Design a protein around this nucleic acid. Sequence first.
RNA 1: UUGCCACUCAGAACUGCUUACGGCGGGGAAUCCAACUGUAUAAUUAAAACAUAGGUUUGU
RNA 2: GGCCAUAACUGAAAAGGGGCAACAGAGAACCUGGGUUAUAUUCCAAAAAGAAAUUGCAUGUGG
Lengths: 245, 132, 108, 58, 75, 90
Amino acid sequence: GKTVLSCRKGNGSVYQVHGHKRLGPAKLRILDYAERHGYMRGVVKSIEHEAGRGAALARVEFRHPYKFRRVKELMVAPEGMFTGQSVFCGQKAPLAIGNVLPLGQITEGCIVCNVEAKPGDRGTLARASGDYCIIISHNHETGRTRLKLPSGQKKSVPSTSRAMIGIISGGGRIEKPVLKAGNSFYRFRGKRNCWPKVRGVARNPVEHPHGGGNHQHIGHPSTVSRHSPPGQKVGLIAARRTGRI
Amino acid sequence: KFLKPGKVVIVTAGRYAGHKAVIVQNSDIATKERPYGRALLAGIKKYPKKVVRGMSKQTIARRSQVGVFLRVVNHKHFLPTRYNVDMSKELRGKINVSDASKRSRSKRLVRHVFQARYNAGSSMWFFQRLRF
Amino acid sequence: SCPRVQYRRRMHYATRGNRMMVRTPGNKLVMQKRAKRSQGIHTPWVLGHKRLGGTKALRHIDARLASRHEKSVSRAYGGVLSHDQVRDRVVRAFLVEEQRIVKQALKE
Amino acid sequence: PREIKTLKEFLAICSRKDARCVKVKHNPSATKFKVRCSRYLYTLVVNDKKKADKIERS
Amino acid sequence: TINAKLQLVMKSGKYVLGTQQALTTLRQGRSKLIVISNNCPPIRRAEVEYYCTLSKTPIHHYSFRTCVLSVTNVG
Amino acid sequence: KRTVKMGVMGRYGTRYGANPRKRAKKLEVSQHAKHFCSFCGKFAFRRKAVGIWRCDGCSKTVAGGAYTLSTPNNSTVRSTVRRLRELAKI
RNA sequence: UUGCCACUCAGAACUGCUUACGGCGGGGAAUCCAACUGUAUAAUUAAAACAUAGGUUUGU
RNA sequence: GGCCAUAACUGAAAAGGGGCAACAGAGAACCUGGGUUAUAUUCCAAAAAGAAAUUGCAUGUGG
Ligand SMILES: [Mg+2]
Ligand SMILES: [Mg+2]
Ligand SMILES: [Mg+2]
């Protein structure tokens, strides 16, 4: 038949993140010489709200180590970080709530948000609102820290990655219920174009594998294979445990 | 005790807002033209620019001058500090009166002092620039 | 006899840019553009975004030709900073070098 | 247009080189001196017999 | 004894609190004791600290919010 | 004493069911509530945007908490920091 | 201390229609279905369908 | 041989090639009066019917 809405979405024509009222990509300051062999102080000046994100983005300025400017860094804001806090992000940095001292140098059992997997990618993990990681184990013989991602899935990363100290701002967003379709309209209008979700079982059997019939029923089991081709990999993909627990 | 004459301050909150200036005569209470603490002070409008050590010539004179103002600034517009200049609160602190026809010649002697006291090595701090 | 009016210029749209209605010495009531009165000179948005005193709100044409003392006071950081944000910047520029050179040098 | 608030500065700027014309004016309650320079017109309005004086020569 | 060391201080005379005025009492040198509330920004909670160490005045930090108190009479 | 049982949520009336209104009322009453700023001292924080709190009287913007000022796990985090600073230094 | 620049309501009698532009909800009792506002078969289908908030699941 | 002056041809640091895309965003130095069969914030000529603002280059009074 025709291509399915999910398949007809990696074309990214209309279903492409909007990001016009967004600020730049929020990420740690670039891992230069200064954040390896010392620290550098930076003042938090503005905490804005990138449209389409529950976490506050704090505009942190540092000094450019080499030219004479003041380079300006956009970072996700750990909760509690206020305007004018003098954030330190280096090697010898203190461990106050917001600093970006390296991950294998943070004490164990600590609480770290905006951790980064690879040493330099400027912050990937634990970076949505209220999310964070707990440092569990350091392996100084291997040089790799095992932190516990905000999904239970605890992984090992190198002990030279960087990480903020705290919880990402905007925690507790997901608990205030929406109460109306219109407050879901304005949530996704800063996010991408996936709303409303028409149920594939309410579609025609040309546009979706579930659609069809005189009754709205999924004809065959919803759990589809991991290996199934796109346009078929719809429903519960490689569902290993199924249904209410 | 804190604002003794000859003690250098920073002239906060004025045309000369960050300049360093020495108190030469403080006061307590005036009747109608100064309800405020009335520390007259002379200070720097023209800092002597850094000695280039290069073309040591009359340009070193044209770039090591000290321009001087005299104002009776209120005490809530200073910021006293640890230092002094010892610029003769009893010898020079009286031949620098503030009445009319004096701010013409009295100003040109506390200027005439900073001329030489910077050309000589005395403070090396009072003649820097308060960078803000 | 209540005349109506026209958008005299070639833009006939009611955008916040036009905002035009005056009586004429020929009694030919007709409406003219305004200037979009800009907000004036302000402190930085970070530092408590406030209007500066002693400064005008001149537009790109009034500002490009009027004198320089219509847009700045005679202080340091005049026309960018208010007296509040100068006087606090001079003690912090001095109480820091004071707490420094006594505490960066205590090692004999 | 400026209005010369002077008898000296006016007679200076009125006797300048531009002097496109000097339109003598008579109106109620005053007597007005329109000099037409190249870019302004400078007026000197007066309430006195000094109008007819500086009218003959200026 | 913060509220007690300051109680009879009110039984004595010329109670003065307020940042701007806790300095008018230092320039005109009549300030016996000065108290700094520990909920003050480190600018003039570091500037009035500069004056007490500049005029050998005593200092105190304890914690109509009262942010600073400079007294001239004791008790 | 208007509106005896469901308060701020009177905006909706019969709609949205009782418990979604009541779960969202707990969080709608706090984001509009002024909080305390250990800075200025007096209650001054409003909620200029989700996870963003501004204090006019303090003139400083704390970040954090979507419908309150400090999520009560930051309350534990904020201590564990100094817990793992001071005791981990002295 | 009574001077000058206000049409709104309230009441009184008076009289006279129980006949008077225009504009301007019929209401109640129930049962069924959908919670709701919403969208939607342009040119026969506006619904009980879609959406929806909510709930859960799966992958990661 | 230097008073003074234009010019040549070098070449001082300076990261991030250009370039379009808005007759409703931004920006944008002019206002009345009046004498066309039909144009005018467009035209009017010298008692510019007037009055302004403004850009470029110039001579020159002010330091
Ligand atoms: Mg099919
Ligand atoms: Mg199938
Ligand atoms: Mg503005």
